[PDB]
Amino acid sequence: SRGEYVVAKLDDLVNWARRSSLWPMTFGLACCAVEMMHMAAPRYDMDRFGVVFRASPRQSDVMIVAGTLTNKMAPALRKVYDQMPEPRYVVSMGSCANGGGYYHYSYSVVRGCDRIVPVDIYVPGCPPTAEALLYGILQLQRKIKREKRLRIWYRR
Amino acid sequence: TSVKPIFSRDMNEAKRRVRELYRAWYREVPNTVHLFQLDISVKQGRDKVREMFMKNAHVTDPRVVDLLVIKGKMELEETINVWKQRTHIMRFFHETEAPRPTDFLSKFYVGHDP
Amino acid sequence: TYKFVNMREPSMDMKSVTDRAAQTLLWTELVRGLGMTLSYLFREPATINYPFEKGPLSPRFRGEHALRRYPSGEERCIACKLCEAVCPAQAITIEAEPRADGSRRTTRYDIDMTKCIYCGFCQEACPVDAIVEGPNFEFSTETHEELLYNKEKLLNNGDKWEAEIAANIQADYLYR
Amino acid sequence: LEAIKDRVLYVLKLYDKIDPEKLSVNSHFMKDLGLDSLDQVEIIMAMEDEFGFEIPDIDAEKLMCPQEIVDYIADKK
Amino acid sequence: TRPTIRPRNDVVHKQLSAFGQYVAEILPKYVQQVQVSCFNELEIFIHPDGVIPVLTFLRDHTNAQFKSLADLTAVDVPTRQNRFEIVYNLLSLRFNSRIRVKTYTDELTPIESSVTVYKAANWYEREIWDMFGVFFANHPDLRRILTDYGFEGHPFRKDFPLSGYVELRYDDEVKRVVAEPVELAQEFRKFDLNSPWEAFPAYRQPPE
Amino acid sequence: LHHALIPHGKGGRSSVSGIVATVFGATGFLGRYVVNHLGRMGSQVIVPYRCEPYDTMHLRPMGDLGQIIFMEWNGKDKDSIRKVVEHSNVVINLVGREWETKNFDFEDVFVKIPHAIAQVSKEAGVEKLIHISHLNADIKSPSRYLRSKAVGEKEVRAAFPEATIIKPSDIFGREDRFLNYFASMRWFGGVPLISLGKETVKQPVYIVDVSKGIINAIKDPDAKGKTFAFVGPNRYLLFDLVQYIFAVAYRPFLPYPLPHFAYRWVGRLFEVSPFEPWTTRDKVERVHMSDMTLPHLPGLEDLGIQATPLELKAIEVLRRHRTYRWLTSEMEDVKPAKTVN
Ligand SMILES: COC1=C(OC)C(=O)C(C/C=C(\C)CC/C=C(/C)CC/C=C(\C)CC/C=C(/C)CC/C=C(\C)CC/C=C(\C)CC/C=C(/C)CC/C=C(/C)CC/C=C(\C)CCC=C(C)C)=C(C)C1=O
Ligand SMILES: CCCCCCCCCCCCCCCCC[C@@H](O)O[C@H](CO[C@H](O)CCCCCCCCCCCCCCC)COP(=O)(O)OCC[N+](C)(C)C
Ligand SMILES: CCCCCCCCCCCCCCCCCC(=O)OC[C@H](COP(=O)(O)OCCN)OC(=O)CCCCCCCCCCCCCCCCC
Ligand SMILES: NC(=O)C1=CN([C@@H]2O[C@H](COP(=O)(O)OP(=O)(O)OC[C@H]3O[C@@H](n4cnc5c(N)ncnc54)[C@H](OP(=O)(O)O)[C@@H]3O)[C@@H](O)[C@H]2O)C=CC1
Ligand SMILES: *P(=O)(O)OCC(C)(C)[C@H](O)C(=O)NCCC(=O)NCCSC(=O)CCCCCCCCCCCCC
Ligand code: SF4
Ligand code: SF4
Ligand code: SF4
């Protein structure tokens, strides 16, 4: 149908922009954030793909939870996630962010950042290499490529 | 056996310090509700302060009372300086935990707990 | 021995004073920094073209886990639980029983990849080279549960990566 | 002193734990009214909120009767 | 040669023993015991109320210039009447040496704060309080340093469970993080590793 | 009971409650609350969704690992309905739209879909069915919404005789329509009311109370084939209710009487939006309609729930509508509205 074709093209265009312009919030917790710096480094330059760190959560699209999430830190992470406007995505990085990690059976560690925020991508490793994190970012981009919001709305 | 007192010597001065801390907490609940934008009432906060003070009413050791008032002052200055968030202040109220059964028949039904 | 990083005084002769004044009024060190940045601009970047180009790795690399087999097809693991005992993060859960033919083989071999710290202790403690850490590192998932590997998943990883795992173990086994 | 007395009684009547029927100018807080240390402390704080002057802890412990309250307020003006 | 055995230093052992005798003679009112470990570390056990005099002496004395406080922690031994064991590690740069001073306390007995001798004692004693429950009397700002706000209990105590009693999650109904009793999908599997055969005869205790 | 359906634990996140529930319409207000309560219990939750998977993300943290399962579903596909209800002993139906789109009508969302869910669930052997209806569900009602509600209630009762039909009055909460719809009329100058809201009586019910009642209806063994009425503790006139809403929001209250035909035309104007409409003719009819009184049907007190008065939870919803001048004002600063009991 003409309307179906129009909405398909429009949300192909919309998903392309969001996929190609990703702005992670400048947010790192532990040793996993060093591999974020090495992904930002010249070797695996993240700025090629349109992935740029922004300090303010208002101007951020993705939250890369890279490090251990503690009980004393969970409210701040939830606060910045809430203050991030939509559409927003979450990439947990490393064992600590995925589940508990080396500190799973601890009194002061949250066993998974997905207990706090909805996580879109999980990156495995301790720490995941910069290439592993880049693969996770590209996988997030491909996940964005498949979103059909206007197509869902047209048939709604 | 004579022991080194933390404060308060005998029990009367410990009770005096308890009353001082209770006044400090009682005069703080309106400020806590205003600053943290709590949806609870001021009466609810004062009742919670009273309840938290009353669960230690069986203590008969002045040193334990002194340590309790020290920790109460600590958690009061965390509330005054807004070091705490609404998260902890409402953690005081257990708003999300399901009501645990307390009778033998219900406890027998639910599980193996004593 | 020791040295002073900054304890030098400048000469107060007229030529040196004029040189410093020219540096102050004419921003000489700032121009020098500009020249350094321009040189780096005209240099060649150190960026690889991922995913079409991959960063170098070594035979010792610790990536995704795998359960190996003997060349006959028999599983190497003998349910000895040395890896489970030595695991720092307690990421391995093992349950075993005698098999139909009486072999000492596992029935449950779980690794929580969100709990594992990828430290390589399990493959060091294995006396039969059963559990290994393969070369794979691009195995990120979209859901948490997909990272809770079990015995079937680990055996599939071993069957999938057996050639590269065997080559790496052959390359690096004389150092162990 | 009548103004102080009526203000004290008005404050006491607003207290939830205070029974207006049993309330009187000679009613002992602990015995006649059946309160405890913390209730008396809250009463003293409410009295401070009315007359706007600081009552120390040592003096507040000797204010177990409304007549004692009005005597203390009159002495301190 | 014995390549696999650590060589010993009798010179340093004798020097440490002599200095331990020196300090024990100088401060008989507080020093209870002096030991030199076989890897040349001097350890001084003193009365709990001698902390300020002993530390001030070890800092300001001409023959003991331990001007640096390397560390300050506590050890929990529940089998003792005074379960908590406060440990001070001092470094003397002038004589290129290190010393250890150990005192004892229990739950209800305060220990004098040494922030007037070393400024690092401020945060070190804050951590000791937060993690063990030891109260320090004259501390400029004594409060929690590492645990969460409102956290109940001192976690480094031996009787404190490894996972604690509460855990955190985000509840959508109340639109905030909540604290609920700890519940584990997989329980921490406790291992009994000790062998029933004695390893070191040198440390064998009398049957008593 | 199957060996895997026996409850274990202490009713926590990592426990087992023996409840396997397929929750239709879980990507909504009541849906999110019900899913949160089930996951908090520690139950198995299946979430059939037709929307973009991005719009189901708030439901991910609501349960432990593997306890929330998202599967696609159509509503016109009994195959998908069976696929999602095959392995669950509880089926909860909260599907509904306050407006009508091109593809789904009030007949489709309130008659055809609930009847298909009930019929398919009966074949699949689902033990318990919970079906959400409306308190003012009348066959001769002026509102097509409520007429379809009544027809769908009868169809569900016919298809699944062992059902629990719940009839909330008007759910108010953070993501509700009720308090937000009343508090969003600041932009259109004054507040248009039919007969100035003097001829309408309403007793709204709290969302957490409704979700708790839904959860307790599953656990109660003697609520198998029953009908409940979920209403609040106090009944208000519409004028008093809107006045209290605006007082709590600290907005100037400027009511004015607008005749019913004019308000119907206004609602007709606003329903031409391809997106979610701000108001509709059926919405106007429902807002004007007084809540019914059904003393014979059981309710929250019968299911063990003490209904939360509006004066305790109104500030959660209406603090968002305040300005910076009045953001920090406390809950006790506004006198409670005048009730009609
Ligand atoms: C907190 O812990 C920490 C971290 O964290 C864990 C860290 O990581 C690190 C590590 C730190 C780093 C690695 C440093 C940060 C990394 C870097 C790479 C720094 C580099 C910074 C930059 C390169 C700056 C880039 C920043 C931004 C914001 C660039 C983004 C671009 C924009 C915002 C521009 C968008 C606006 C646009 C495009 C305007 C155009 C729009 C229009 C509408 C114009 C068009 C209008 C028209 C009318 C045109 C229409 C005309 C038409 C159609 C006709 C034309 C004719 C035709 C033929 C077409 C550290 C130290 C750390 O401590
Ligand atoms: C600036 C002022 C506002 C502008 C308003 C719009 C103006 C026109 C917008 C320009 C459109 C640019 C489209 C770019 C197409 C993407 C190129 C191509 O590579 O994309 C492919 C196809 O992309 C998608 O299929 C759809 C892209 C957009 C399709 C066009 C939709 C219609 C656009 C024209 C209509 C504009 C007028 C209507 C709007 C105003 C998939 O690539 P991808 O996988 O990702 O790359 C991965 C990286 N690799 C290759 C290294 C691995
Ligand atoms: C030659 C003639 C001209 C040819 C081209 C004609 C069209 C050009 C574009 C016109 C502008 C956009 C028109 C509207 C697009 C469709 C928007 C829509 O219907 O969105 C509905 C839907 C909302 O969500 P829904 O599915 O309803 O579910 C409720 C959520 N719980 O889903 C959403 O809202 C999805 C979120 C994004 C919606 C806005 C973006 C739509 C695409 C805009 C593309 C152009 C952007 C230009 C930006 C300004 C210039 C830089
Ligand atoms: N809310 C209220 O004030 C009251 C509500 N009720 C009833 O309670 C129930 C729940 O209400 P509520 O949560 O507020 O409603 P919502 O509008 O917030 O949510 C409706 C849910 O049903 C889904 N849905 C709607 N239409 C369709 C369709 N055609 N096909 C498939 N899925 C569909 C939606 O999914 P998606 O996002 O994918 O479209 C969403 O998950 C409804 O039946 C309603 O009539 C009763 C009394 C008062
Ligand atoms: P009268 O003197 O006869 O009675 C005095 C009382 C009632 C205190 C007892 O009879 C009594 O003297 N008991 C002896 C033991 C004792 O004095 N215990 C007091 C312990 S101090 C204490 O427990 C401090 C607790 C701090 C409170 C924490 C604050 C929590 C409130 C948070 C705010 C919630 C909303 C803002
Ligand atoms: S997963 Fe490993 S590398 Fe990453 S934060 Fe945890 S301990 Fe550090
Ligand atoms: S690499 Fe280390 S942490 Fe991971 S499973 Fe092996 S022993 Fe355990
Ligand atoms: S160490 Fe090797 S043989 Fe032993 S249980 Fe582990 S994988 Fe099996």
CSV table of N, CA and C in Angstrom, one decimal, chain B residues 24-25 28 31-32 35-36 73-84 89:
chain,number,residue,atom,x,y,z
B,24,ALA,N,15.6,16.8,68.4
B,24,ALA,CA,16.2,17.2,67.2
B,24,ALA,C,15.5,16.5,66.0
B,25,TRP,N,15.2,15.3,66.1
B,25,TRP,CA,14.5,14.6,65.0
B,25,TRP,C,13.0,15.1,64.9
B,28,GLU,N,12.8,18.2,62.9
B,28,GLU,CA,13.4,18.1,61.5
B,28,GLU,C,12.4,17.5,60.5
B,31,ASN,N,11.0,19.8,57.8
B,31,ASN,CA,12.0,20.1,56.8
B,31,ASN,C,12.4,18.9,55.9
B,32,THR,N,12.4,17.7,56.4
B,32,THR,CA,12.7,16.5,55.6
B,32,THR,C,11.6,16.3,54.6
B,35,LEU,N,11.9,19.2,51.9
B,35,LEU,CA,13.1,19.2,51.0
B,35,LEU,C,13.1,18.0,50.1
B,36,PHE,N,12.8,16.8,50.6
B,36,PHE,CA,12.7,15.6,49.9
B,36,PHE,C,11.5,15.4,49.0
B,73,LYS,N,22.3,10.5,65.7
B,73,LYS,CA,22.9,11.8,65.3
B,73,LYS,C,23.5,11.7,63.9
B,74,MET,N,24.2,10.6,63.7
B,74,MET,CA,24.8,10.4,62.3
B,74,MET,C,23.7,10.4,61.3
B,75,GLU,N,22.7,9.6,61.5
B,75,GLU,CA,21.6,9.5,60.4
B,75,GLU,C,20.7,10.7,60.4
B,76,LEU,N,20.7,11.5,61.5
B,76,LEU,CA,20.1,12.8,61.4
B,76,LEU,C,20.9,13.8,60.6
B,77,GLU,N,22.2,13.9,60.7
B,77,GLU,CA,23.0,14.8,59.9
B,77,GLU,C,23.1,14.3,58.5
B,78,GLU,N,22.9,13.0,58.2
B,78,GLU,CA,22.7,12.6,56.8
B,78,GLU,C,21.4,13.2,56.2
B,79,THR,N,20.4,13.3,57.0
B,79,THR,CA,19.1,13.8,56.5
B,79,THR,C,19.1,15.3,56.4
B,80,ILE,N,19.8,16.0,57.3
B,80,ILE,CA,19.8,17.5,57.3
B,80,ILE,C,20.7,18.0,56.2
B,81,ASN,N,21.8,17.3,55.9
B,81,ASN,CA,22.7,17.8,54.8
B,81,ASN,C,22.3,17.2,53.5
B,82,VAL,N,21.1,16.6,53.4
B,82,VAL,CA,20.6,16.0,52.2
B,82,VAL,C,21.6,15.1,51.5
B,83,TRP,N,22.5,14.5,52.3
B,83,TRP,CA,23.3,13.4,51.8
B,83,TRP,C,22.5,12.2,51.4
B,84,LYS,N,21.5,11.9,52.2
B,84,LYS,CA,20.5,10.8,51.8
B,84,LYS,C,19.6,11.3,50.7
B,89,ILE,N,15.1,7.6,52.8
B,89,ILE,CA,14.1,8.1,53.6
B,89,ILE,C,12.8,7.3,53.5
